[PDB]
Structures are given as C-alpha cells and as structure tokens.
Amino acid sequence: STCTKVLYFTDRSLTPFMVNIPKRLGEVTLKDFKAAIDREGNHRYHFKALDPEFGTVKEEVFHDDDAIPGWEGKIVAWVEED
Amino acid sequence: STCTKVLYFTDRSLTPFMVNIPKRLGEVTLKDFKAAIDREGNHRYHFKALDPEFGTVKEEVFHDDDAIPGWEGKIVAWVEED
Amino acid sequence: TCTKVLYFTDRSLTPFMVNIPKRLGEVTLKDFKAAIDREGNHRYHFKALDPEFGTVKEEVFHDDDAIPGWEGKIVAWVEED
Amino acid sequence: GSSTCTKVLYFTDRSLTPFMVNIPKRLGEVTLKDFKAAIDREGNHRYHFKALDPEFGTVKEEVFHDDDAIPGWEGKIVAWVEED
Amino acid sequence: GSSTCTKVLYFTDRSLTPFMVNIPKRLGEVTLKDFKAAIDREGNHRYHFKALDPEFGTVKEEVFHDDDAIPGWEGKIVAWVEE
Amino acid sequence: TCTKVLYFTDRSLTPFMVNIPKRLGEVTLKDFKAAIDREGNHRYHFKALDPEFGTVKEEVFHDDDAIPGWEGKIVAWVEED
Amino acid sequence: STCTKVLYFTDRSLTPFMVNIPKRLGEVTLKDFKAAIDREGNHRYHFKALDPEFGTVKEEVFHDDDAIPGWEGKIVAWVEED
C-alpha cells in the first residue's frame, strides 16, 4: 500500500496496461503518471474517479502538478492521442 | 494511387506493422487484407473508420466479401487472437 | 517444478522460449533478466490475469518482484529503452 | 553518416547476431533491389524495415517491389529478413 | 523417404554457412545428448532449436537437459549453437 | 561419367584432387574412403546444395550413403574425429 | 599494441587461421588484411565487431581502404568465396 496500482487503456491496444507507481494514491500527480508510462508525444488523460455528489465520473486532468484521483485504491486511466 | 497504405497492430509487438496493398481503398476487402498479412491463423479484425455520425469508430469486419473502411486514405487495423 | 517462458524481442519477429528452474510464483524479475542474458537498459511486459480486470500487459521493474504468469507459463515482451 | 553511402543493419533467422553492410547509394536512393543485391539472398524472402512514419510514429514496414525505396531510421537502414 | 533417422541443420559462429548431419534416431527419439554427441561439441555451448509451439507458433526453444527430446520443425531439426 | 573430387586434409595446406570412375549420384562414402586409401578413423564433410537450405557442409558416415555433389564435383574436408 | 592478433575462418579448413599484423588495431585497413592473408584475392570479408548501438555484429567491409573493426583487442574474420 506504499505504491499505487495503475491500469490504463490506449487506442494503440485493446488489452489494457498495468504498472505500479512508487508514490501512494494521494501522492501521485499527472507528471508522475506521464513519467510512468513514457508516453511518446502529447495526449489527453482521463481517470475513473468517485465524485462525492454526482458519483462515478471520468475526470480529465491537465496540469502535471495536480494529483490523480483514485478509484478503489487504484488508478484507472484512458489515454487518448491528442 | 494503385495501392493502399495499411498499418496494423498485433499482440505480438507494441510496434505496429505497415504493408501496401495493390488495390485502392474502396476496392480492398477483408480477404485482400487477410491474404496481405494473415493467410494462416484466424483472428478478430478491427479498423479505424470515419463514421459520418458518431465520429471515429473501431469497426469489426465480418463478411469476407465486405470492404475495409479507410481512415484518411489509409487503413488502420487491430488484429486480435480469438 | 519449472516455468515455461516465452518472450518477444525487437530482434527476431519470431519469439524465444526458455525454461527457468524456479516455479511460477517463485520467479522474480531478476530471475527473468538473468535468464535471457541480454546486456540492456530494457522495459519488460508480461501477459497477466488480474483478479479484477482480467487480461492485461503488466510492466515490472523491481528485480525482486515476482513475475505474473498466464496459464502456468510466462509470456513477455522485451522493449529497448 | 552520410552522403555517399548508407549503413545497413539486418537480422536473419540464420544468425542470432545481426549483420552490417554499407551500400554505395544514399538513404533516399536505396531501393529493395539494391538491398537484395547487397546481402546475396539465396531464395524468396520477406523484408521488414524500421521506419519513422510521420503520423503513426515508429513502425516495421514491409516492402515488396524491387524498385520502391527503403525507408531509413536515423540515417541507418534497420531490417529483418524472414525465410518466407 | 527416410523416417527412422533425422536430418539436422545447425548454425555456428565458426562458419557463415550452416552444417548438416543425420542422426540414426527418429525425430521424437533424439535427445540433447544425442545432439551433443552428434556435432561433437567441444565442451560447453548454448543450444536453440526451431520448434512449432501449440498456441505460440514458430519459436526458438532452448534446451538444457541431455535427456530432453529435441523439438523438430517440418520433420527435421534446425539448431543454433551459441558460445 | 566419373567424378572430380577435391578434398582438404589437416596435413597439407594444399588441397588434393582425385577422380572416381563412378558418377556423382553413384558415389558412396565407401567409394570415397576407398578412393583416398588412408586407413584410419576420420570425420568427413562435403560441400552440398540442399534443396531446402542451400549451401551447406554436410557430414556423412554411412559408407553405403551417396556423397552429395556441388556443381558436378565433390568438395570434401577430412578430419580426425 | 605493437601488432594485432588476427583470427580468420575459411572454406579451406574447418580449422581457423591466426596471423599477426604489424599495425595496431585502429590502424589496420582491409588492404592490410587482404595483403596479410595473401588475398588471392577478391572475396567477401566479415569481422566480429562490437557496435555500441547494436552490440555484437558481423560487419562486412569491402573497400581496400576501410579500417577493420576489432573485437577485444583482436580481429576475428570470416572469408567467404564470393
């Protein structure tokens, strides 16, 4: 529980990918994520998140310094080429 | 041109493959495609297609007599074990 | 008893197969690295069956991390970088 | 590089070691026939080349016609030769 | 033609042209020891063989145990002998 | 209707050449052995053009086996096992 | 140093040959090599080389002027009749 399980989808494959990031769920920022998958160019990023009021939601994050929202102690993401 | 540029992904590499088929975009069928890269093993086939309504879509093709949908004069495909 | 390993490289197009003495649960990345004997700064991916998510290509980095199996065998991709 | 010739690195199912040759023509000039002629292939084969596709990025492109020009990757030609 | 012997083709770093020998045993019968004994290895090498895998297809399988049966490809044995 | 034989030996850096009255397809290992008339234990290799893999140094040991030719001739290497 | 150890294989013997060339590793050219083993001589020449890009590789050289790549202080070569 010192690390975070990351599952992400790419339009480059129909089978998802899974990596583990050193930092803990609350600690992980977009930059950490970007660095984690060694993305080729620049893209759009979405994350399965549990919004308190409106419920489950696919949240997009931009600034590398923003923390990634988790879903059940893990991070679920979609990577769109953009 | 008297040829269509084909880019396809396989589970056997994260780097895509590229071949050129003598037929033109509208002319190319699934059989042409199969013959082009896949005479032996049976797979599921998906193609990046521009749907005039809902935007980009990954269309699966079925009929051997059916035509392969193009995306920007090219064919982009995913080949899966199934 | 031992583990059947099938891996792909940017150097063959045709996969490689080796057998590691340790059993599926026992095999760590270091065991794998040592097994393939290539001098490299590589990335490693493995076909894995995650309880919650199902089929997935998992990347591993610690040498002391145990390699996930798929059907009592290990299926891997070795990238350059 | 560069300009008189082209560095060619190819893999064969016949060797676990890659091979390296240098072709007189420059990167843009080299055709498949030039390549074929270069490595004394004894039989029909399939040929793949590491190429940088503007849009879709890195890719292993197969070439068929002896006249078509071989795509380069960082000034070198990187190829795979299959017994097919 | 003949089927109680096995055609063996192997590559070495010692020649850019492959070698060919015939082993008295049949494809299923041939073990690594049989192979070693055959091409008269001088000591220690790594051995790879072109093999047809069930789900995985054509694959270069490495074998270690003398008593292991060498996998065939198209009724012959195709091998690489590394240092 | 005979066969030109060129062979190399570890006791001469100059190859040897003999002619065997049999024709290419007819010549066996025994014919070859007899031809060189050297009583001893040896390994024999022959330049051959295999229909499948092409140019190759094939080893033979069944005396009753036909020697593979290379362009209407026989090219051989003689060692000591 | 003062001279380079050369080991070469021929279709003339299943046994390799060894000669020593006066020049040093970096200095030795193909012409030097040809001259060294009484290049009849116009054949194909290959050399075990340590390429920093792709590691161990059998490099072919064919102009008399080009300098022979070494492998661990020595030269390892294959001479084919071509």
Numbering used by the authors:
A (entry chain A), B (entry chain E), G (entry chain G): 389 to 470
C (entry chain B), F (entry chain D): 390 to 470
D (entry chain F): 387 to 470
E (entry chain C): 387 to 469
Excerpt from the paper describing this PDB structure:
Interestingly, the mCcd1 DIX domain forms a unique double-helical filament with seven molecules per turn along the crystallographic 21-axis with a pitch of ~145 Å, in spite of weak ability for homopolymerization. Two left-hand helical filaments engaged in homomeric head-to-tail interactions are arranged parallel to each other. The crystallized DIX domains contained seven (mCcd1) and one (zCcd1) molecules per asymmetric unit. The mCcd1 DIX domains in the asymmetric unit had essentially the same structure with an average root-mean-square (RMS) deviation of 0.55 Å for 391–468 residues. A double-helical polymer of the mCcd1 DIX domain is assembled via zipper-like interactions between two head-to-tail helical dimers by the insertion of loop β1-β2 into Site 2 of head-to-tail interface in crystals. The mCcd1 DIX domain forms contacts with four adjacent DIX domains of another head-to-tail helical polymer through two types of interactions. The first and fourth contact sites present type I interaction between the hydrogen bond of Arg400 (loop β1-β2) and the carbonyl group of Phe442 (loop β3-β4). The second and third sites present type II interaction between sheet β1-β5-β3-β4 and loop β1-β2, where a salt bridge is formed by Asp399 (loop β1-β2) and Lys446 (strand β4). Comparison of mCcd1 and zCcd1 DIX domains revealed rotational differences of 39.0° caused by type II interactions in double-helical polymers, which involved the insertion of loop β1-β2 into Site 2 interface of head-to-tail contacts. Furthermore, structural and mutational analyses revealed that mCcd1 DIX domain auto-inhibits the propensity to form homopolymers by the insertion of loop β1-β2 into head-to-tail interface. Interestingly, two mutations, L402A and W466A, in mCcd1 DIX increased the molecular diameter of the homopolymer compared with that of the wild type.
